[PDB]
Write a protein that binds this ligand. Sequence first.
Ligand SMILES: [Zn+2]
Ligand SMILES: [Zn+2]
Ligand SMILES: [Zn+2]
Lengths: 183, 183, 184
Amino acid sequence: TRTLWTTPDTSPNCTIAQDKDSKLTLVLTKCGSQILANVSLIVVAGKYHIINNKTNPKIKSFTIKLLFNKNGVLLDNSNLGKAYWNFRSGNSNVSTAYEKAIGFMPNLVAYPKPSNSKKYARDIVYGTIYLGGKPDQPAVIKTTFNQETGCEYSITFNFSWSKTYENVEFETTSFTFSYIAQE
Amino acid sequence: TRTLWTTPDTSPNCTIAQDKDSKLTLVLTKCGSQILANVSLIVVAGKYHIINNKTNPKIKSFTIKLLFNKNGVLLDNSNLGKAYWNFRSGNSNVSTAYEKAIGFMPNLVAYPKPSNSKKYARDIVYGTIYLGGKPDQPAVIKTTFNQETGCEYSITFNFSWSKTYENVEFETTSFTFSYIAQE
Amino acid sequence: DTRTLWTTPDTSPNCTIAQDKDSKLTLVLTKCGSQILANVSLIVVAGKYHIINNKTNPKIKSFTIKLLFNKNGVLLDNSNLGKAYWNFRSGNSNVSTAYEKAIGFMPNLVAYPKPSNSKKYARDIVYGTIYLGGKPDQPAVIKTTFNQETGCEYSITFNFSWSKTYENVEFETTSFTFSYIAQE
Ligand SMILES: [Zn+2]
Ligand SMILES: [Zn+2]
Ligand SMILES: [Zn+2]
């Protein structure tokens, strides 16, 4: 009841360019007023599985979105599958889909939805991870809170890189960050 | 309660160069022997609001200080105002000023005040944040524990940058870190 | 549950990198349910890695500290870290008995598998950057890896490396925080 997660195995659960082309591992732990998060990505097939910027010069980034409703439940237009997201039960998930998780949503006062007033950057956290664990293959992970339309809350992970990679598999090291909770 | 904060709104609470020229958003959450911290800065007026180093080549850094007494109560000569620094209640604060928060202070044995004993670097944490959320606009945030004089405990944030920015507004992305607690 | 397992915050040598007790590893693990919040720093006080000079010794560029654990989450004598002051917390010191069980502090074996011939994925690694002497122009990379050592049930390995050419620099670092998925 204190941890929402994807389960840490290697089974594809996410759709970037084609159905089930990747495995997003994401763990959210409630430490009262802040949520502690840990994330990593493995692309298993399709367009982003093996990066070759000599063959495809413009393939330099992609986005994974998690959209939630007023009760903190995952919406189906998210890249991550609904069957794969729930409160932790041992090393798996609970049997039935959860009904409420408002205490895990990014705080709307710290991070407001888009509008006409001035937009601040505190709703963004930047980090860097490394492809295949290699020190010379960095890629940036930019995480933004509550900026998508069609939902009450959102968490989006944008992955991007500036080097010209030649035949590199897109599977990453892990990164931790935290954010202020709604309740 | 488990959380000491500045509240998540954006009304000025801090004085860097002139009265209430900025909003420091700082959340301290107690997870046992460690404190989980989340910080961000928005400057709204004065000398550090808009940076132009072609015009003022020497404005390259500034500091924000938090000084506390033996009970963990904030001293009035801190750059952060005493008005809204308090334990959390919803998206605001408890009605009455707290009188004890020793469990939130940086540990004096891990981070000792200046003496003639050898000074170690472990009382420092470095992080990089981005102005306006732009990937090409980094600034470094250096956090130091218990090195100020005239107080039993202290937390100081130093912000600096090496690039020659032209009309860049100082408002940052968020950074998360942690430190060992006194009790 | 919400306990702290640590090395104590003093500065008394407690770890062996190149010679006996040449360093002080300060490591604090706190349990927050299913994740462990970690905080680490290092002070080397003697030996080969105490004062770095890559003008006279260009090849001295990295070193490794390993913490090996058995099935109950107890530290094994062959770790670089000494068993004497690695224990649960009490005030600014430790409880009076060497611990029993700490499986709730061990890195998750499904998330981070032991070596085998199955594909090895990079998620069992966390990279961080720290600074020597607190100086902004002296970085070093700290690479942390989970469960990749043999001869144990679990492990946490810290590899320290640097690419700058240092000249007579003392290896004592700022602190870094990371987290990992707990076994239970
Ligand atoms: Zn393949
Ligand atoms: Zn402005
Ligand atoms: Zn020394």
